[PDB]
Enzyme design. Structure first.
Site, mmCIF file in Angstrom:
data_model
loop_
_atom_site.group_PDB
_atom_site.id
_atom_site.type_symbol
_atom_site.label_atom_id
_atom_site.label_comp_id
_atom_site.label_asym_id
_atom_site.label_seq_id
_atom_site.Cartn_x
_atom_site.Cartn_y
_atom_site.Cartn_z
ATOM 1 N N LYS A 1 18.966 85.502 58.304
ATOM 2 C CA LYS A 1 18.766 84.178 57.719
ATOM 3 C C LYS A 1 17.269 83.978 57.362
ATOM 4 O O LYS A 1 16.419 84.717 57.851
ATOM 5 C CB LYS A 1 19.367 83.045 58.611
ATOM 6 C CG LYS A 1 19.048 83.077 60.099
ATOM 7 C CD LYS A 1 19.187 81.659 60.663
ATOM 8 C CE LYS A 1 19.065 81.499 62.184
ATOM 9 N NZ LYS A 1 20.306 81.945 62.885
ATOM 10 N N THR B 1 49.940 104.171 74.931
ATOM 11 C CA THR B 1 49.058 103.030 74.589
ATOM 12 C C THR B 1 49.785 101.872 73.859
ATOM 13 O O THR B 1 50.015 100.833 74.517
ATOM 14 C CB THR B 1 47.706 103.401 73.885
ATOM 15 N N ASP C 1 22.107 88.402 62.568
ATOM 16 C CA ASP C 1 21.432 87.104 62.459
ATOM 17 C C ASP C 1 20.474 87.079 61.258
ATOM 18 O O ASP C 1 19.296 86.655 61.341
ATOM 19 C CB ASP C 1 20.761 86.733 63.772
ATOM 20 C CG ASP C 1 20.486 85.253 63.891
ATOM 21 O OD1 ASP C 1 21.195 84.456 63.225
ATOM 22 O OD2 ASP C 1 19.559 84.883 64.661
ATOM 23 N N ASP D 1 13.435 89.479 64.342
ATOM 24 C CA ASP D 1 14.457 88.903 65.233
ATOM 25 C C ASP D 1 15.716 89.744 65.424
ATOM 26 O O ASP D 1 16.761 89.495 64.819
ATOM 27 C CB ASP D 1 14.834 87.489 64.764
ATOM 28 C CG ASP D 1 15.619 86.674 65.825
ATOM 29 O OD1 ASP D 1 15.882 87.185 66.931
ATOM 30 O OD2 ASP D 1 15.961 85.515 65.526
ATOM 31 N N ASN E 1 14.526 84.281 60.017
ATOM 32 C CA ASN E 1 14.385 85.637 60.532
ATOM 33 C C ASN E 1 13.934 86.630 59.484
ATOM 34 O O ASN E 1 14.073 87.831 59.714
ATOM 35 C CB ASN E 1 15.690 86.146 61.133
ATOM 36 C CG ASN E 1 16.088 85.384 62.342
ATOM 37 O OD1 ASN E 1 17.240 85.432 62.778
ATOM 38 N ND2 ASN E 1 15.144 84.683 62.915
HETATM 39 N N1 LIG Z 1 6.801 89.930 64.456
HETATM 40 C C1 LIG Z 1 6.544 88.679 64.050
HETATM 41 N N2 LIG Z 1 5.511 88.391 63.206
HETATM 42 C C2 LIG Z 1 5.260 87.136 62.803
HETATM 43 N N3 LIG Z 1 6.008 86.104 63.233
HETATM 44 C C3 LIG Z 1 7.056 86.236 64.089
HETATM 45 C C4 LIG Z 1 7.405 87.593 64.535
HETATM 46 N N4 LIG Z 1 8.472 87.489 65.351
HETATM 47 C C5 LIG Z 1 8.771 86.166 65.427
HETATM 48 N N5 LIG Z 1 7.943 85.417 64.678
HETATM 49 C C6 LIG Z 1 8.048 83.958 64.486
HETATM 50 O O1 LIG Z 1 8.579 83.312 65.651
HETATM 51 C C7 LIG Z 1 9.991 83.147 65.593
HETATM 52 C C8 LIG Z 1 10.467 83.885 66.837
HETATM 53 O O2 LIG Z 1 10.956 85.241 66.788
HETATM 54 P P1 LIG Z 1 12.518 85.174 66.753
HETATM 55 O O3 LIG Z 1 12.517 83.704 66.992
HETATM 56 O O4 LIG Z 1 13.125 85.381 65.386
HETATM 57 O O5 LIG Z 1 13.424 85.396 68.088
HETATM 58 P P2 LIG Z 1 14.655 84.302 68.318
HETATM 59 O O6 LIG Z 1 15.044 83.677 67.017
HETATM 60 O O7 LIG Z 1 16.063 85.031 68.715
HETATM 61 C C9 LIG Z 1 14.272 82.940 69.480
HETATM 62 P P3 LIG Z 1 15.787 82.016 69.980
HETATM 63 O O8 LIG Z 1 17.003 82.894 70.010
HETATM 64 O O9 LIG Z 1 15.601 81.414 71.464
HETATM 65 O O10 LIG Z 1 16.053 80.838 68.896
HETATM 66 C C10 LIG Z 1 10.419 83.632 64.210
HETATM 67 O O11 LIG Z 1 11.429 82.800 63.549
HETATM 68 C C11 LIG Z 1 9.094 83.680 63.437
HETATM 69 O O12 LIG Z 1 8.778 82.379 62.968
HETATM 70 MG MG LIG Z 2 17.747 85.847 67.940
HETATM 71 MG MG LIG Z 3 14.677 83.552 64.959
#
Ligand SMILES: Nc1ncnc2c1ncn2[C@@H]1O[C@H](COP(=O)(O)OP(=O)(O)CP(=O)(O)O)[C@@H](O)[C@H]1O
Ligand SMILES: [Mg+2]
Ligand SMILES: [Mg+2]
Ligand SMILES: Nc1ncnc2c1ncn2[C@@H]1O[C@H](COP(=O)(O)OP(=O)(O)CP(=O)(O)O)[C@@H](O)[C@H]1O
Ligand SMILES: [Mg+2]
Ligand SMILES: [Mg+2]
Lengths: 249, 253
Positions: free
Chosen positions: B132, B161, B130, B152, B135
């Site tokens: 992008k 076989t 993932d 993230d 992230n």
């Molecule tokens: N360690 C960290 N330090 C600073 N900011 C962070 C961080 N981890 C996450 N964030 C902020 O919050 C968001 C959340 O973490 P992350 O979102 O990437 O998990 P996720 O993307 O899988 C949630 P979902 O899958 O439900 O969309 C990031 O895009 C970033 O903006």
């Molecule tokens: Mg994710």
């Molecule tokens: Mg994210």
């Protein structure tokens, strides 16, 4: 912990690339088991997969685990013994089966897989060398062995993600068709004169019921097979259907 | 475990479908952190993350350590959420830094760091899956060559076989490290403010991707930059540029 403190070791019952299965007598109880020594890679997890699934299952038609041991370089699985050798070997001494016998092996196998599929387990290695006789009875009793290919089935992205398509329970069903075809004839429906060719054969679902073997085969037996050797998994007969098929009735 | 005993909650740092991330201060020490609150799945149901997926996220973070990836401090859990206390990255998402402004050098400065992080991860047989801008995070948004940490890891995985074998196993190719590489391709490209395969439908976008339907539009482009993207945005995985190759690429070394 030392397995040689609990079991007296017998001689081999099987081999593979990275596993020896030897017969083993439990010191305390006198009962005999099949010990599977899986040599670990020294530089696995596939071994915990195999164990956790063997631990979950209990069915008359699948092998049970008894205990688990680890030494320096092999991880050891004490398993339910099965004494009648491989359906593969019963299949060799018998050259093929009448429909009535095939159906009575096939009923047992079907039941084992039903059970497994009810637990989202896919075996992924259904074949005669992995099917085993209890006693070699005129109407013998089988147990499904050899797990761990077994698996629990549940904009920036790259092309191979975009069209992923995960594997499932349907692969088992396909093997069952291939098993049945072999059961009723000498033969293996896809085999070519080379591996390339065989793989091409399986992909193009390129088989026939040749007269040498199938000239008198029942409509119902052909139907059962045809319905399981179907390229797109979503149109293959499932375990539940297969148990109702009038050839099984 | 009970996190409010040990952390004062802060401002929301970001959000998602299944998680919320906030700044928190470790009461023990004054230090600051990012608390990723992940909603647990009720049943096996498609709201929340499964216990298995949460564990995989924790496990991988527990294992990694490298300047371009983020660290895990502690894990809490209540009836509703698994809370990950993470190394804070204070300078916003690369996404937002891009929204607020790229020459080839500015872009190159970011890419190398990403390459460095992905090379580290790959060397552990971790595919990120993932990559992008949202992230990717900057240590600080106000310096001339911002530093970055990959964040993230919710989709990250370890990378491991015939006669009897069904057609779909015959034809089965597993997902591995090369996916990350394609993504880097998309990332490089967004460095134009433009996404190479965007459609109008999400179907339109998905058609594009699997067909490899990008162009270098005169509106945006105007030279070794485009060779780099091209030897990455490639359909057959096994013939894409790997992370070592990308690092040996002349636009890089
Ligand atoms: N360690 C960290 N330090 C600073 N900011 C962070 C961080 N981890 C996450 N964030 C902020 O919050 C968001 C959340 O973490 P992350 O979102 O990437 O998990 P996720 O993307 O899988 C949630 P979902 O899958 O439900 O969309 C990031 O895009 C970033 O903006
Ligand atoms: Mg994710
Ligand atoms: Mg994210
Ligand atoms: N429970 C059991 N009772 C009797 N024999 C058994 C057995 N389990 C295994 N065997 C012997 O070994 C084979 C089954 O387990 P198996 O050996 O297939 O593991 P495996 O297939 O991982 C070896 P490889 O993958 O290296 O080829 C059978 O052909 C059988 O003869
Ligand atoms: Mg075997
Ligand atoms: Mg095996």
């Amino acid at each position: 912990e030392n397995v040689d403190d609990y079991y007296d070791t017998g001689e081999e019952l099987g081999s593979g690339q990275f596993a020896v299965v030897k017969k083993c007598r439990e010191k305390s109880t006198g009962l005999q088991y099949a010990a599977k020594f899986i040599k670990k890679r020294r530089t696995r997890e596939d071994i915990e997969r195999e164990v956790s699934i063997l631990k979950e299952i209990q069915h008359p038609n699948v092998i049970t685990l008894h205990e688990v041991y680890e030494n320096k370089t092999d991880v050891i699985l004490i398993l339910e013994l099965v004494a009648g050798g491989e359906l593969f070997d019963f299949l060799a001494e018998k050259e093929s089966l009448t429909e009535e016998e095939a159906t009575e092996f096939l009923k047992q196998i079907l039941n084992g897989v039903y059970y497994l599929h009810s637990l989202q387990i896919a075996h992924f290695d259904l074949k005669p060398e992995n099917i085993m006789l209890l006693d070699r009875v005129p109407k013998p009793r089988i147990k499904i062995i050899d797990f761990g290919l077994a698996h629990k089935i549940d904009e920036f992205v790259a092309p191979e993600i975009v069209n992923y398509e995960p594997l499932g329970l349907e692969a088992d069903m396909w093997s069952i068709g291939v098993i049945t075809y072999i059961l009723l004839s000498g033969a293996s429906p896809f085999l070519g004169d080379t591996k390339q060719e065989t793989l091409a054969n399986v992909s193009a679902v390129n088989y026939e019921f040749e007269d040498e073997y199938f000239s008198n085969t029942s409509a119902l037996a052909k139907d059962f097979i045809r319905r399981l050797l179907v390229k797109d998994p979503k149109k293959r007969m499932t375990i539940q259907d297969s148990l109702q098929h009038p050839w099984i009735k």
